[PDB]
Design a protein around this nucleic acid. Structure first.
Ligand code: NA
Ligand code: NA
Length: 327
DNA sequence: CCGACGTCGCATTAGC
DNA sequence: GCTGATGCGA
DNA sequence: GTCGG
């Protein structure tokens, strides 16, 4: 299934989704439109009617209506109107700044702050996160080619090992699945000395090292288990600079690591099926552990996990490579 | 018909 | 000050 | 907004 097949419908729903999240502050309506957008995006025929589309899981009466209006007129009256609305369109746009959500965007627009120019005119009213989001607004919306991800991984793995050779790091996300580009870099970190029953600087030391070699350029948030920040590859001599990229690093206990690696490798749809599989085998998987039920439904103790495949073994499924984890 | 819809670490601010 | 709720991103 | 108990 291609773009031109139902792109006008999926773009319509995605737009509606964004206005729900950012303007109406209705997070569940936001997800509902997206779920409709997703299932339609995968549908292998040019939709002829709203009724045809309503058969799909996630498409109800209201979206079937909108599809019927779109097909007949090439537009949606409500979407046209809200696009044209200065207040709403500005609130929606401002949320594209990292750190500016629906609430902060509303306040800015309430007091006349509506554009990037206005934001740059009013730094004093931005928190640390939002200034960074403003500074790298364009960079953060770019894709990351796999070649650059590999170069970034080279640096991360190298420096992590230099701090302590007993560290274990894994770049997860769609990168580990072999996607040809990424939205960011998600790093999962662990150490033999850090377990569930179980220093307060295991993560700090790694962040500090990546900063010393000037890979990590900025910090959005930093605690004892989770770092969120900005990084950049070294300029390849006299050539143009690389865009700044978003990078997350999390420290996970050794006994929860591969459950963490499994979850943050994805995809969402794969994860959902593997948690459905799964319960029907009498197990419950979260991002941290896998646990047995339990005849009356009571969750028992977390089972020991020493690899990804270990989780598969518990639930009667053969191990599937991240390359094959789209669903 | 009416509640669920993912969950949580971190930054920031509320109320006291 | 401290205790907790909220916003945000993922 | 959609699903389902
Ligand atoms: Na449906
Ligand atoms: Na934002």
């Amino acid at each position: 299934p291609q773009e031109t097949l139902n792109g006008g419908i999926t773009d319509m729903l995605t737009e509606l989704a964004n206005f729900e999240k950012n303007v109406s502050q209705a997070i569940h309506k936001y997800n509902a439109y997206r779920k409709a957008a997703s299932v339609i995006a995968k549908y292998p025929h040019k939709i002829k009617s709203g009724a045809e589309a309503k058969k799909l899981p996630g498409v109800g009466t209201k979206i079937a209506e909108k599809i019927d209006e779109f097909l007949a007129t090439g537009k949606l009256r409500k979407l046209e109107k809200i696009r044209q609305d200065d207040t709403s369109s500005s609130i929606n746009f401002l949320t594209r700044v990292s750190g500016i959500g629906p609430s902060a965007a509303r306040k800015f627009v309430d007091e006349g702050i509506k554009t990037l120019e206005d934001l740059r005119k009013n730094e004093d009213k931005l928190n640390h996160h939002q200034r960074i989001g403003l500074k790298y607004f364009g960079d953060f919306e770019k894709r990351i080619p796999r070649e650059e991800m590999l170069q970034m991984q080279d640096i991360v793995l190298n420096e992590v090992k230099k701090v302590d050779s007993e560290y274990i790091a894994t770049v997860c996300g769609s990168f580990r699945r072999g996607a040809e580009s990424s939205g960011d870099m998600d790093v999962l970190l662990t150490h033999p000395s850090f377990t569930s029953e179980s220093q307060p600087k295991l993560l700090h030391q790694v962040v500090e090292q990546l900063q010393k070699v000037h890979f990590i350029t900025d910090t959005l948030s930093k605690g004892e288990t989770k770092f969120m920040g900005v990084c950049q590859l070294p300029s390849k001599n006299d050539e143009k600079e690389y865009p700044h990229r978003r990078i997350d690093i999390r420290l996970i206990p050794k006994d929860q690591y591969y459950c963490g690696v499994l979850y943050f490798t994805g995809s969402d749809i794969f994860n959902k099926n593997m948690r459905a599989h799964a319960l029907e085998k009498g197990f419950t998987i979260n991002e941290y552990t896998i646990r047995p039920l339990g005849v009356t439904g009571v969750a028992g103790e977390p089972l020991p996990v020493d690899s990804e495949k270990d989780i598969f073994d518990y639930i009667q499924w053969k191990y599937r490579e991240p390359k094959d984890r789209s669903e």
